[PDB]
Amino acid sequence: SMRIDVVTIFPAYLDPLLVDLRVHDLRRWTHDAHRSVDDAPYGGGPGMVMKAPVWGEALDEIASAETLLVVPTPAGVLFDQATAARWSAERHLVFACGRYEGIDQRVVEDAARRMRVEEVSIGDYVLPGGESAAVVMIEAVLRLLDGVLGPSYTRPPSWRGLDVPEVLLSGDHARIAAWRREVSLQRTRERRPELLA
Amino acid sequence: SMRIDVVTIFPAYLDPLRGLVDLRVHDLRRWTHDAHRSVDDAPYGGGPGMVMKAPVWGEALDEIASAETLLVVPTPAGVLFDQATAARWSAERHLVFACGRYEGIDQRVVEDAARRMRVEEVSIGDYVLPGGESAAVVMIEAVLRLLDRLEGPSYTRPPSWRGLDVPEVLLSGDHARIAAWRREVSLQRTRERRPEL
């Protein structure tokens, strides 16, 4: 039903992880003895940029017109639960994992001529590579596929002088739902006030 | 200089991530006391899934953490992790990541730990992961990267590729025009993808 390809210069990074998950070494698409995937940026600046000649060949082999190409980037639109649910209905996801200063922008523009491309950030922080971001996104999608085939407490009722809220022991499904909504609302006001506009 | 302990029921998860930094991974089952080495139990108040037990977690953190520790608890209900947090955590002597699984850790673990250490409940973004291990990887990567509004596009050779040319300004050699162009693309990119910034 779903195929997921991950392209990276660090295939061992996805070892931690109906669904056919494949991980590809980007160096398989290099033609030199040094298996070179990067080169100096135009306009100067530190670091190296991943070459379009290498990425172009990798995507020519792996992706088709039906593919949804995900490019992790700290400059992309934010990944969220609505995106994970939408991507869980896809037949083919491809994750182009960037390293160094990222992939040559023309790779994305060229892919977008035949397939759908989404440049996505997992959050407002900087990772050294796109591998952990692909892992995070694949986990959120796979979690939804597994499911479609507030604070938590368990025993003991009292621990280190801290008791489970009495409402959770009441057996009253309505009062429990009302309490969980109140704690959720209080947490949102304190931690994420922007979610209440 | 910095010690990082990761506590999880999946120690092999952090294998690809591993002298200034001492990174250690602990199997949470080391602090269980039953024959089944069980870390979870049914939730109070009903609901699907299991909850990780406070006795196991309390004992693990009593051994691993001290008053100088900063305990990070991944949770989709936490304050958002960001670059400012990664920079702040890079100055810490001891970070401990309590990786949740199932429906999460019994809330009393955090309240009890906060009696003898600093605790931060942190979300890596507005999506749901099956466990906190990938979230710990993402956070540790952002901190380790530092110890080692939107970004513009990057380009490398060739100057023309599949009919797509590198912007002429990047070939001009004019540091002033290049800086002006990068500021403009950064601004346009932010307007299209993150207008709230």
Ligand SMILES: Nc1ncnc2c1ncn2[C@@H]1O[C@H](CSCC[C@H](N)C(=O)O)[C@@H](O)[C@H]1O
């Ligand atoms: N917040 C984020 N979300 C998604 N991918 C990100 C990301 N931050 C970084 N990446 C990934 O990491 C790659 C390199 S970004 C630059 C990191 C490098 N240490 C440096 O100092 O330049 C990007 O191409 C992207 O794939």
Ligand SMILES: Nc1ncnc2c1ncn2[C@@H]1O[C@H](CSCC[C@H](N)C(=O)O)[C@@H](O)[C@H]1O
């Ligand atoms: N956005 C996020 N940021 C940080 N940690 C998260 C997270 N989403 C999930 N987690 C981690 O994943 C654990 C389980 S929460 C969700 C999994 C649960 N089996 C379910 O299907 O509801 C949490 O305790 C936390 O450690």
